[PDB]
């Protein structure tokens, strides 16, 4: 997860003979793995146009993460201090954990050596004007490198707490009215006092298989900050979107439809999950007036095909569902979930009551905007067939079921 | 019994690849437990040359003790 | 109570005497990770923080503030990176009349290596360790099973959905840092693997010494040219590699595979068994080799 | 993150003598809120209008203009003294980051002996860089500095080491430059006549990409990686590099749309060149050209300077190509040019245009094949990377290229709308079926229609186990329902056991003889991985012959159907 710190020194620019190092944890670690400080003094102790920055450089197999600080005043020695906790890693990792944690550290030593004089006092001589530094090194290593997390006392009132957080990849703006949110987690339990409102609003809404819009309306919510706290949730790795359930969809195989067939664990979990718990009144309708076998599930999700829609395929094999009191809809969400189908989804491209102006003129700026079915049928609050109706009133239209 | 083992009067070194922090024993002395961010792996002392169970617990902190 | 810290000094508390100050303070040229008190004896086990060689200390505790420093009596040489943790193995008597048990050093280091190190009788003599005594209590008695092995326990009916066949280079490279300190059955296995990756292995055991292995070789009496998908069992005795004591090696029946060439491989196989065993060396390289290529 | 994104924001030309760092021409000279958020004026005028110039107009604009002499709030002495590092730091990697923009190169400087390479300012010049600044995010840093690092900053800083120690080249070239910018800031009336800071820059630079070679190169280059093509450049009239970040357009298993975004028009399909560049038999396949044949060579002539035979066969090679017929059939092209040396060229020639965004790899297109609207079909968004649409342009391209066909609209619906049958369903007459597949292999190559592959699985019931059982034997009970079956799927049957070998031996129990030769000869690739056109192709088999043990074997052959 993080990578543990090769060498922590401090560096400081002595008046007498320029930049040196004070202490190094472990002892001799440089010098003993070939890395000479005074290749890079320049980049340590830089101008102090390039101090205060967050410098990080790659030096052989090594990376070396730096935060310079210089400090002007005259009660220093030559009308500045400079000073940097300089820390060296690996090459072939990610620093970016620990860059906020040097960062701050190299901050919160700026603001210390400012206020009281802490660093310039703690060489004990009377050169650099007109605690123990390897305790604290020490700690800070072996702290970061077994703990990810430090809490270490320098003063009576100062102490050095960092925590080393995983970045996480921002969510994608993507998320639009027609997807539908899937919780991947109980919801309910995480709910402590610190959480948004209108994130705590849209729990209880969150069954997988309401829109946003749906959830929006169900929930007295300005869609935009629906879209928003779902973006939040995406950025917790914890729910993931998917497609308004429609017998007028169509749905097709994947190419991970194998992955049914090479699991121990999926088919066993779609004969628990597809299936009744009772013998269910679906299971006795008509089409027109033991546990099912991971075979037959197999057998249906090879079913399903490009262009036929789910009110064919259903028709086509409804006795098969009747007799094993499996739910259409929840093989569906199944089959979307283990990512074995995927939803091909409807273009309505150009070449009954009467209709609204503000209606007519979303109408018309999804049309241009080559909009799926679902997102229109979600801004009009209609089904597939008034929009049809509407369309085919408006002009002559085809499908791409890609 | 614990009498018949093979590794205990011997000299032994496993090579345990995974970053792993801390470890534990049985006081009877059968198994030995290994931890890392990725989770637990429980050795046989008496049977080396078995892979370890390896029990899934993904954290990004480094696990102590 | 004893203490360490990073300056390298040991201190020994008792604060029944007095709170301030220390009984023994034992200073040393390395910090200290991890000390702790010998659970046999009166002594103390430290191990070092960054340097000191990498290497466990033992040091007998035996005297009457006292600034000292550090002698030791052995030191766990090895482990080229540092040390993050040491354990210890007891065992003893089931029923318990004399304390007679016996104790192995387990570290764990940086470096990926986890390291048995064996105490001597003369590390029991020389801290003033008493191996016999009848004890006041018995000591405890704990379960020897292993745990290694996975655990397992409207209707479902019976059925082989998927085959397992159809479902090891995480075994063939856990074998390689396997080391008793060729002179062993796993390490050759996965030095074998290691040098054959087109050879499959579907069974590794060694503790109950079978192995089940499978390859595609040129045995087609049809064709030379064709390769013939195999499967071979070996059975090792527990006298393996030792003279008059072969491995067993059972073909599995093949349809593609003639019965005058499996009887052909067979004995050839026992041939290059046989006789790799009469100069008690290890017969499983030569035999791979014979079954697919030369 | 899948999307392209080259991540510059400008070149250096850092140089060191003996009397200390300098710059010598960097470009943009714009600031940093727009980059993150007599006879010289006739050759300037000719070589802007015969195209020899390709600046940016917005890098000199009122608002996106800094000064000269500083680069992203630093100076050229401060930019020169902090990428100017020691012996020991060049010759290798100089990654450097502030805060947020990373200062990535490969300085070349001279050995202790004084050769550049190991087989006034000629002599003074003892280091060089070409340093490339770049704003990755934290969480993509990795990725874009090493693919930045390995496909453009390695291969340019090689070169120019090369030509250097060949040449010297680059001493010339920043002495011209030199000498340039003082002919210009005190010499040139017309640069104190024009008006404006940035309109002075504009003049001058365009001054310097007129006479120096290295700037049209560095200018060339960044423009054309900023832009994400392929940056073709001149280096001492003797010798081009062509230098490219590939783009991540290629996928066999579907992304999710609507959490990791990916280019529409992304080729969703099961042969891939990313699994056939790993490699370096490929010429079993066909190319699809990406663009027009004469815009392909167009392209292909600023890939050399001389017309080698390279280029020449190449040129044969695009001029006279057809997608629908494999590539193992036009050694007859390149054995009237000069397992096998022709094989050889038409394999370095496969490499050459399918790796450098050129001629895509396919399976050879048929009216007999069954062709699907890809999801990743770009239909909506009104550019590739947007996240009027796309569709209803591309409708006409479509028109403009097939004026005697229906439109995109009506070719997209007729797929998409019934079961997916064979491509020739669509074909009204034979006189319409060379331009209709030329309409599929424009649908192809626009990502808009994938192939739908046939994949076989080998399933077994109870009446195979039981006539198995009965053999084994030969070397409830009171009822017998018919929908209680015990099937059971081998997923491998090369690493079948004896009693699943004989399942797979007893499927094919009364089947004729050529039915027994075809089932022992596709036995290993029924895994339900393998499509059976690779196995068509592969195994010289027909089509016939395939659908014969379709339907001579319905209950035993698992049928899967995806790209």
Known sequence: ?????????????????????????????????????????????????????????????????????????????????????????????????????????????????????????????????????????????????????????????????????????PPTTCVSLEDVPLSSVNLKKIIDVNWDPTMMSI???????????????????????????????????????????????????????????????????????????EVSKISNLPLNKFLPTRSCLFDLYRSLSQGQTLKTWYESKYMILKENNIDIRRFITFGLEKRIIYRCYSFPVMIMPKLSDEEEGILEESIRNAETFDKICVLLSKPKLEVESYLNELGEFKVINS | GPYNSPTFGKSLSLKVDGGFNAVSINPSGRDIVLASRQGLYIIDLDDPFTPPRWLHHITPWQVAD | ???????????????????????????????????????????????????????????????????????????????????????????????????????????????????????????????????????EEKLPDYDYCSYNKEPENFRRLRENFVTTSGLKTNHITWLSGIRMNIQNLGEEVSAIGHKFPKVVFEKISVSTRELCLTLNGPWSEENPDDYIFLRISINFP????????????????????????????????????????????????????????? | ECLPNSCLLGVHLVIST??????????????????????????????????????????????????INKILEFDNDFVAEFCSPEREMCNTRFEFTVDNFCFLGLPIHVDSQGRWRKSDLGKNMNMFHVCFVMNPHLIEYNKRIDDMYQFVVTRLSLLLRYVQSKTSYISSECH???????????????????????????????????????????????????????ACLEINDDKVISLQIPIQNEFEKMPNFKLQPVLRGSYLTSILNMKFLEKSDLLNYALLLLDEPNNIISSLETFSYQDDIGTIILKHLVRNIQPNIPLRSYRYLITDLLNSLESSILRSCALHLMYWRHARI?????????????????????????????????????????????????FLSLLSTDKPQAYSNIIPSREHKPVYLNALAWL????????????????????????????????????????????????????????????????????????????????????????????????????????????????????????
Not at chain 1, 247 to 272: E, V
Request: with cysteine; net charge neutral; charged share 25%.
């Open chain 1, 1 to 169: 997860g993080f990578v543990p710190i090769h060498t922590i020194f401090y560096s400081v620019f002595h008046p007498t003979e320029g930049s040196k190092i004070k202490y190094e944890f472990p002892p001799n670690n440089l010098k003993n793995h070939g890395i000479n400080f005074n290749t890079f003094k320049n980049y340590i102790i830089p101008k102090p146009i390039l101090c205060h920055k967050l410098i990080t450089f790659k030096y052989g197999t090594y990376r070396i993460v730096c935060y310079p600080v210089t400090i002007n005043s005259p009660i220093y020695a030559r009308n500045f201090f400079s000073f940097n906790f300089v820390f060296v890693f690996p090459y072939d990792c990610e620093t970016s954990p620990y860059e906020p944690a040097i960062t701050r550290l190299g901050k919160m030593f700026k603001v210390l050596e400012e206020q009281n004089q802490l660093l310039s006092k703690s060489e004990r001589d009377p050169v650099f004007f007109d605690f123990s530094i390897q305790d604290l090194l020490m700690r800070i290593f072996q702290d970061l490198n077994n703990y990810s997390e430090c809490l270490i006392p320098i003063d009576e009132g100062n102490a050095v707490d960092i925590k080393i957080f995983p970045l996480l990849r």
């Open chain 1, 203 to 277: 729990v209880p809404y969150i069954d997988g298989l309401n829109s946003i819009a749906k959830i929006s309306k169900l929930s007295n919510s300005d869609p935009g900050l629906v879209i928003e706290c779902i973006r939040h949730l995406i950025y917790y790795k914890c729910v993931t979107l998917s497609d308004i359930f429609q017998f007028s969809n169509i749905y097709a195989p994947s190419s991970l439809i194998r992955n049914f067939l090479t699991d121990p664990l999926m088919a066993s979990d779609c004969q628990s999950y597809v299936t009744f718990p």
């Open chain 3, 1 to 135: 109570i004893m203490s360490s810290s990073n300056d390298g000094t040991v201190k020994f508390w008792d604060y029944s005497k007095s709170t301030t100050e220390s009984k023994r303070t034992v200073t040393t040229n390395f910090p200290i990770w991890r000390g702790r008190y010998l659970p046999f004896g009166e002594g103390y086990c430290i191990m070092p923080m960054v340097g000191g060689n990498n290497a466990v200390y033992l040091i007998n505790l035996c005297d009457d503030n006292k600034k000292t420093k550090l002698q030791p009596i052995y030191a766990f040489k090895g482990h080229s990176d540092r040390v993050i943790d040491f354990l210890w193995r007891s065992r003893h008597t089931c029923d318990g009349d004399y304390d007679d048990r016996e104790f192995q050093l387990v570290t764990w280091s940086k470096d990926c290596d986890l390291k048995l190190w064996p105490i001597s009788d003369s590390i029991y003599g020389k801290v003033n360790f008493d191996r016999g005594k009848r004890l």
């Open chain 3, 238 to 294: 527990l006298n393996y590699p030792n003279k008059g004591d072969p491995p067993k090696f059972t073909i599995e029946e093949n349809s593609n595979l003639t019965m005058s060439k499996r009887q052909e491989i067979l004995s050839n196989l026992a041939t290059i068994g046989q006789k790799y065993t009469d100069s008690n060396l290890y017969c499983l390289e030569p035999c791979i080799r014979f079954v697919l290529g030369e």
């Open chain 4, 18 to 67: 003996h009397s200390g760092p300098q710059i010598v021409y960097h470009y943009p000279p714009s600031n940093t809120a727009f980059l993150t958020n007599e006879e010289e004026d006739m050759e300037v005028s000719a070589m802007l209008q015969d195209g020899k110039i390709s600046m940016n107009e917005i890098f000199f604009e009122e608002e996106n203009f800094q000064d």
């Open chain 4, 176 to 230: 011209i430059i030199l000498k340039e910018k003082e002919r210009v800031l005190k010499h040139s009336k017309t640069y104190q006549s024009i008006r404006g800071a940035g309109n002075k820059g504009k003049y001058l630079y365009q001054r310097i990409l007129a006479k120096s070679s290295l700037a049209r190169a560095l200018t060339e280059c960044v423009d054309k990686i900023q832009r994400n093509e392929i």
């Open chain 4, 362 to 410: 396919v399976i050879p297109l048929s009216s007999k094949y069954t062709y699907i609207v890809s999801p990743l079909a770009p239909i909506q968004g009104y550019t590739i990377d947007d996240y009027v649409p796309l569709i209803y342009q591309n409708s006409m391209l479509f028109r403009s290229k097939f004026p005697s066909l229906p439109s995109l609209p009506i």
């Open chain 4, 444 to 563: 192809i190559q626009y990502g808009y229609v994938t192939q739908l592959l046939t994949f076989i699985n080998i399933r077994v019931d109870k009446h195979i186990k039981m006539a198995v059982d009965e053999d084994l034997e030969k070397e409830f009970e009171y009822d017998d329902p018919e929908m209680q079956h015990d099937y059971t799927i081998i997923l491998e049957p090369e690493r079948a056991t004896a009693i699943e070998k004989r399942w797979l031996y007893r499927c094919i129990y009364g089947q004729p003889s050529d039915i027994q030769i075809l089932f022992n000869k596709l036995l290993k690739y029924f895994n339900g991985k393998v499509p059976m056109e690779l196995v068509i192709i592969k195994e010289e088999i027909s089509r016939h012959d395939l659908k014969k043990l379709l339907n001579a074997l319905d209950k035993y052959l698992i049928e899967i159907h995806h790209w």
